Amino acid sequence: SKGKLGEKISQFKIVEELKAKGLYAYFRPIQSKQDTEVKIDGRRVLMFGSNSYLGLTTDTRIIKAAQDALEKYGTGCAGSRFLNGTLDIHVELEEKLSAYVGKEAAILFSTGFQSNLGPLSCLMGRNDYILLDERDHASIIDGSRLSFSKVIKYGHNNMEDLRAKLSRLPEDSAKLICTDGIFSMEGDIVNLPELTSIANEFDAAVMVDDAHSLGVIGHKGAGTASHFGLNDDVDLIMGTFSKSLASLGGFVAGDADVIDFLKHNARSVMFSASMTPASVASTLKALEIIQNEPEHIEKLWKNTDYAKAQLLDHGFDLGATESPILPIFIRSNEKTFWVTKMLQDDGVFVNPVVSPAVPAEESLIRFSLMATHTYDQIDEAIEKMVKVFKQAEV
């Protein structure tokens, strides 16, 4: 029955209002492969809103590995890994990821999102504590709410606040600190040296979500612990396959005892069907290419350094990024929606960040680089962004 349900959703008017104003630019229906240019409404659009940092979703070797796995294993495993849904190739990919991030063992999940839910829901319990950076990804927030522990946020990269909040807690309790490695929004890197120093002093477990780090920072792209040299101070390395690795799924890697506990207790791996064969093979083939072909990471960072320097030369107000995510401040929700839609209509795709996610005065567009971008495409996008920021009177 719909009376009270209709009341619950009655005040949600922003989408209605964006559509009526001709500003709506969510769920844009793309007609072609994710690439540096995409087809929308039959027209070519420069893509600066992707997470495919290495441009690998179009690599013919990765496509063919996925098509070969469909031929051999079919379209799905139709069960959780726990029961009838494990393939030899899942176990292969766990062993290859464990080697890549320097840990004993890994367990796959069918999404990155579910890879956070698993460890955060089942390791800390009643009378234990989870400590979260306040800017942590939604899936970390949600995973911790699925635990039976007390969840405490600390100020963004605020080591004095992390230390003070840990200091208040009973000695006779377990603690886990979970942090993004590279943070989605502003593209900044966690203070992993100080956070791990604090963790060692309080015997707190450390988990790092490397969704935006893997393929980006660390030796051969192995992520944030690899970037800092702190493999032996991080208990759990989480990743996704949907960004650099050009697929779908994710993992958590760690000590074999912890991982065996995880793979038999995490509801998000016991009660969810396993990754499709095509995505296992695509991830395996992408992981080989990231390591064997250093040019992809090389070219991502040349494009990042070039675009950041061009944006700063043209006087754009950038956030404190340390990654291929270039946050460009606009500081008005209305102007952020307008700029986003004007850029779309001029053939440039960027992602808006608006209230209520951020305060109006911190609203921005995110301009993300891929290895496969050209300096020409970058120059065309920044040319158009200068024109639209002028038209919009930012």
- Residues contributing to the annotated binding site: 112-113, 212, 240, 242
Task: Compute the least distance from the CB of residue 315 to a copy of itself, in Å.
Answer: 26
Tell me, yes or no, if 212 is annotated catalytic: yes
Stretch that binds a copy of itself, among 151-159, 264-272, 306-314, 331-339 (CB under 8 A): 264-272
Q: Toward a copy of itself, which CB reaches closer, 11 or 315?
A: 11
Pull the structure tokens for residue 82. 């726990």
Q: Which of 8, 126, 168, 390 lies at the binding interface for a copy of itself (CB under 8 A)?
A: 8
CA gap 204, 298 in Å, rounded: 35
Q: Toward a copy of itself, which CB reaches closer, 8 or 390?
A: 8
Query: What are the Cα distances from residue 384, in Å, to 29, 41, 129, 144?
Result: 22, 20, 48, 42
Annotated binding site for pyridoxal 5'-phosphate: 112-113, 212, 240, 242
Stretch that binds a copy of itself, among 213-221, 251-259, 316-324, 383-391 (CB under 8 A): 251-259
Binding pattern to a copy of itself, positions 12-31, x when CB under 8 A? x-xx----------xxxxxx
Q: Toward a copy of itself, which CB reaches closer, 71 or 313?
A: 71
Stretch that binds a copy of itself, among 152-160, 217-225, 260-268, 298-306 (CB under 8 A): 260-268
CA gap 65, 284 in Å, rounded: 9
Tell me, yes or no, if 184 is annotated catalytic: yes
Taking phi over 0 as left and psi of -120 to 50 as alpha, with beta for the rest, 90 belongs to: alpha
**Nearest Cα to Cα of residue 304 among 236, 176, 216:** 216
Q: Establish if 265 lies at the interface with a copy of itself (CB under 8 A).
A: yes
Query: What are the Cα distances from residue 88, in Å, to 69, 81, 93, 277?
Result: 12, 11, 9, 10
CA gap 371, 303 in Å, rounded: 7
CA gap 189, 20 in Å, rounded: 39
DSSP code, position 213: T
Binding residues for a copy of itself, rule CB under 8 A, total 114
Query: Of these residues, 137, 212, 227, 373, which one is catalytic?
Result: 212
Task: Compute the least distance from the CB of residue 123 to a copy of itself, in Å.
Answer: 6
Q: Establish if 260 lies at the interface with a copy of itself (CB under 8 A).
A: yes
Q: Establish if 271 lies at the interface with a copy of itself (CB under 8 A).
A: yes
Stretch 58-97 residues interacting with a copy of itself (CB under 8 A)? 58-59, 62-63, 66-67, 70-79, 81-84, 86-88, 90-91
**Nearest Cα to Cα of residue 226 among 324, 100, 41, 126:** 100
Q: Is 346 exposed, middle or buried (0-12, 13-18, 19+ CB in 10 A)?
A: middle
Pull the structure tokens for residue 305. 């350094």
Amino acid occupying residue 376:
D
**Nearest Cα to Cα of residue 271 among 389, 54, 109, 41:** 109
User: Strand 348-349 to strand 236-240: parallel, antiparallel, or no bridges (unpaired)?
Assistant: unpaired
Stretch that binds a copy of itself, among 54-62, 289-297, 316-324, 325-333 (CB under 8 A): 54-62
**Nearest Cα to Cα of residue 223 among 239, 200, 236:** 239
CA gap 207, 76 in Å, rounded: 30
Q: Cα(first)–Cα(last) distance of the chain, in Å?
A: 47
Binding pattern to a copy of itself, positions 172-191, x when CB under 8 A? -xxxx---------------
Q: Establish if 278 lies at the interface with a copy of itself (CB under 8 A).
A: yes
Task: Compute the least distance from the CB of residue 190 to a copy of itself, in Å.
Answer: 16
Stretch 121-160 residues interacting with a copy of itself (CB under 8 A)? 121, 123-125, 128, 137-139, 142, 145-146
Task: Compute the least distance from the CB of residue 215 to a copy of itself, in Å.
Answer: 11
Q: Establish if 235 lies at the interface with a copy of itself (CB under 8 A).
A: yes
DSSP code, position 56: G
Pull the structure tokens for residue 319. 């956030």
Q: Establish if 237 lies at the interface with a copy of itself (CB under 8 A).
A: no
Q: Toward a copy of itself, which CB reaches closer, 44 or 219?
A: 44
Query: Of these residues, 90, 103, 175, 243, which one is catalytic?
Result: 243
**DSSP of 264-284, one letter per residue?**
HH-HHHHSSBPPPHHHHHHHH
Binding pattern to a copy of itself, positions 305-344, x when CB under 8 A? ----------------------------------------
- Compute how many other C-beta atoms are within 10 angstroms of the C-beta atom of residue 247: 26
Q: Toward a copy of itself, which CB reaches closer, 74 or 193?
A: 74
List the catalytic residues: 184, 212, 243
